[PDB]
Amino acid sequence: KVGFFKRNRPPLEEDDEEGE
């Protein structure tokens, strides 16, 4: 999938590529 990691992780920890 791709809507269950790029969502909860990014906020919580800096996991997915934010974007800046």
Method in brief = NMR
Q: Which residue has the tokens 């919580």?
A: 12
Q: Do 8 and 2 meet the contact criterion of CB atoms below 8 Å apart? A: no
Residue 11 in 3-state DSSP? helix
Q: Which residue has the tokens 């590529």?
A: 17
* CA separation, residue 9 to residues 1, 5, 18 (Å): 14, 5, 10
Rounded Cα gap, residues 9 and 14, in angstroms: 7
Q: Do 5 and 16 meet the contact criterion of CB atoms below 8 Å apart? A: yes
* CA separation, residue 15 to residues 6, 19 (Å): 8, 11
Q: Do 1 and 11 meet the contact criterion of CB atoms below 8 Å apart? A: no
> What contacts 15, CB < 8 A, 6 or more positions away?
5, 9
Q: How many CB atoms lie within 10 A of CB 10?
A: 14
* CA separation, residue 14 to residues 2, 3, 6, 17, 20 (Å): 16, 16, 10, 8, 12
